[PDB]
Design a protein around this motif. Structure first.
Motif, PDB file in Angstrom:
ATOM      1  N   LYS C  25      32.189  43.190  44.284  1.00 15.78           N
ATOM      2  CA  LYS C  25      31.521  41.908  44.278  1.00 15.78           C
ATOM      3  C   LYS C  25      32.542  40.808  42.998  1.00 15.78           C
ATOM      4  N   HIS C  26      33.275  39.990  43.260  1.00 18.81           N
ATOM      5  CA  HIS C  26      34.287  39.687  42.564  1.00 18.81           C
ATOM      6  C   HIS C  26      35.195  38.519  43.752  1.00 18.81           C
ATOM      7  N   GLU C  44      30.882  37.043  42.403  1.00 19.93           N
ATOM      8  CA  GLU C  44      30.905  35.942  43.697  1.00 19.93           C
ATOM      9  C   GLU C  44      29.430  35.577  43.527  1.00 19.93           C
ATOM     10  N   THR C  47      28.783  29.927  40.115  1.00 21.07           N
ATOM     11  CA  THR C  47      29.419  28.471  40.960  1.00 21.07           C
ATOM     12  C   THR C  47      29.787  27.469  40.112  1.00 21.07           C
ATOM     13  N   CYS C  81      28.515  27.716  45.717  1.00 18.77           N
ATOM     14  CA  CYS C  81      29.205  28.929  45.325  1.00 18.77           C
ATOM     15  C   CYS C  81      30.180  29.411  45.168  1.00 18.77           C
ATOM     16  N   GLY C  83      31.466  32.041  46.153  1.00 20.46           N
ATOM     17  CA  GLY C  83      31.161  33.412  47.712  1.00 20.46           C
ATOM     18  C   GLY C  83      31.096  32.031  48.822  1.00 20.46           C
ATOM     19  N   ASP C  84      30.756  31.217  49.144  1.00 24.25           N
ATOM     20  CA  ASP C  84      30.334  30.560  49.592  1.00 24.25           C
ATOM     21  C   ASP C  84      31.697  29.874  50.310  1.00 24.25           C
TER      22      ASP C  84
END
Lengths: 120, 90, 104
Positions: C25-26, C44, C47, C81, C83-84
């Motif tokens: 999740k990174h 992730e 921001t 974000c 992750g996006d």
């Protein structure tokens, strides 16, 4: 208003922020409390006290930096967000604490902030 | 205190429903904190034999100092069917 | 990015595959000055703004000095974000390449 103002004399709060500003004249003293009577317990008071967090942050720090400091201090997990309020208003993330302080400080010298934690 | 949480797949509906709740609280003399946007929830379905994604937008509104007229008005609010609302009292 | 020239694509692919196993999740971020690499792992869910603020601490930056970041030629939105961003802009080697700079 805030629990801290009912349980601390004005005189002691004013002295506290006076000392902070004498040593750190470019820092903002911040008092945060949660946005949150046969509803009483022997635990209630110690726990309410521990929910109150004070910070002394640079006047040039942003709202976001403050919020990240509060996140660290509350040791929030991955599914948890903290949001902060100044008198019902949610400040912009890029605002400087010193600008908010100039407009919103209490007579006792603290910037009072309500925080809520949300478990996304 | 009335705390309101909204969820929707369509962020257009959620912002409209949120503005509508805020306005309504304000017109009836309540205090409002927010809207507070929370991070969009991102789920995915893997198509086997390629990803299908479902985002859930999230908003919070706190109504502080609800009046007689506030609750009455919330009960009469015609909110879009794609927005789910959860309410907890203080 | 200099790192793309000094490390073979295969070694870079290896680093990110390995960081994403240990931290699923990174997001791996390769950070260079806008004309000195550093590697970061970012939740992730963080921001661009959070990342810029973390990056600010990371450096001996005096008050009044702020970080800015580019992802490509674009200044990304603060509230975007990572992750996006990672999903649309990551390199084939798995790194998100970020260039940073300081302003007063």
């Amino acid at each position: 208003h805030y629990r801290y103002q009912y349980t601390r004399s004005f005189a002691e709060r004013a002295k506290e922020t006076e000392s902070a500003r004498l040593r750190y004249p470019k820092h903002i003293p911040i008092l945060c409390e949660p946005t949150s009577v046969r509803l009483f317990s022997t635990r209630q008071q110690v726990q309410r006290e521990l929910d109150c967090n004070k910070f002394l942050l640079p006047e040039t720090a942003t709202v976001m930096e403050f919020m990240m400091a509060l996140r660290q201090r509350l040791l929030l997990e991955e599914g948890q967000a903290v949001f902060v309020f100044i008198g019902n208003e949610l400040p912009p993330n890029s605002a400087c604490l010193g600008d908010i302080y100039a407009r919103a400080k209490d007579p006792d010298g603290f910037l009072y902030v309500s925080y809520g934690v949300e478990n996304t | 205190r009335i705390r309101i949480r909204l969820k929707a797949f369509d962020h257009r509906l959620i912002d409209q429903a949120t503005a509508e709740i805020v306005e309504t609280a304000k017109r009836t003399g309540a205090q409002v904190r927010g809207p507070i946007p929370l991070p969009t929830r991102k789920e995915r379905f893997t198509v086997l034999i390629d990803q299908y994604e479902i985002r859930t937008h999230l908003r919070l509104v706190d109504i502080v100092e609800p009046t007689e007229k506030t609750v009455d008005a919330l009960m009469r609010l015609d909110l879009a069917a794609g927005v789910d609302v959860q309410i907890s009292l203080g």
